[PDB]
Design a protein around this ligand. Sequence first.
Ligand SMILES: [Zn+2]
Ligand SMILES: [Zn+2]
Lengths: 67, 51, 45, 45, 197
Amino acid sequence: MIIPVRCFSCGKVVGDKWDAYLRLLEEGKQEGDALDELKLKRYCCRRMVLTHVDLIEKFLRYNPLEK
Amino acid sequence: FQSTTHQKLAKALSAKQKKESYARSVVTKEDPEERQRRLESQENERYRLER
Amino acid sequence: GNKVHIGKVPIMLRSKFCSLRTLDEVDLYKMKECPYDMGGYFVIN
Amino acid sequence: GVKYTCGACAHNFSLNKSDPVRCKECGHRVIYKARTKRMIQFDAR
Amino acid sequence: SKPATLSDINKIIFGRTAMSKYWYYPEFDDVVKGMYLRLNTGSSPYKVVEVLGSQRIKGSAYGLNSKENNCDMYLKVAFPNQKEMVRPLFVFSDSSITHPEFDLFLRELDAEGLSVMDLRDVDYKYHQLKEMSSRSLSNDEVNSIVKMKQSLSSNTGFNTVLKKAQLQEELEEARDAHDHERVARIEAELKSIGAES
Ligand SMILES: [Zn+2]
Ligand SMILES: [Zn+2]
């Protein structure tokens, strides 16, 4: 839905690296190289960012219910 | 196959079965049951008058 | 002798006779319909 | 006395248990109750 | 027959928010008639005006409170010393009428040679406002108000989608009837309405 704050397995803060990851992917870096640049060494933390699906972007396309 | 008659026959028979549309669309502006209830009301009124 | 109403037939969603067939992606969102929904069912009651 | 919200144009109004359930401005037939005023607390866990 | 005091006029204060809440009522024309409300002169010292009536002006839709608050109602009022003026609803202020404002209004009435509204008429207006505010609308009245605001509706996403769907249904009816002239006009209208972002 939205990027988790902490890694499930070890608890490293990964919630501040989503926009930087998207930026690095925009510049043309490979996903593994982008994860290396963000200093995500353990594959438990790499799984968190590599397999995340951003569903909040779809939820935000519906009109707000209160104004 | 390359004969013009065979090609024209194949084209005609292929495009003949492509056209199939019987039902015609329409736009409803009011309640479809309005006629039934208004005619039932008129029939009940004339039944009372006839009685 | 004119059009007589003979009944109401339930409509299968996303078919040629459904209202959502034409709607594009934006109006589908405005109609509170999910774009991932595929249709193929009826809504009875 | 009780606040509501329209399901289409998100307009706020009130009802007195005697008006028809409708939106005032756009006439939608679907309305939603407003959130309460009581205190809401969560344990962040 | 007794003169109306300040509190009697304060009982019948009808704010701009209340006006927006009640301007579309059919009885609101007679309700607002003869009422006294604070008005923004603009040229600003606020003054009191007497409502001689109301007149709907088509094509003069104006923002009442917000951008979506389109209104066509206009109020025909008149200063005593000055002449008749047609003003929109948002010119009035929700703030209460002050003592020098009412005193100046009384002096203008004395200069013109007019009197103040009777206490019986003040109570009649108060009962009229309470009945109108506590009234329960009927289905036909609600539909009439909705149609009136739809006529006032410049644009609304839900209504545009509904209109486009109705136009598509009319287009398929015209296509199934082999009407090559109507379908071109409906396609042109859809092209004009469409091209969203
Ligand atoms: Zn980890
Ligand atoms: Zn509404």
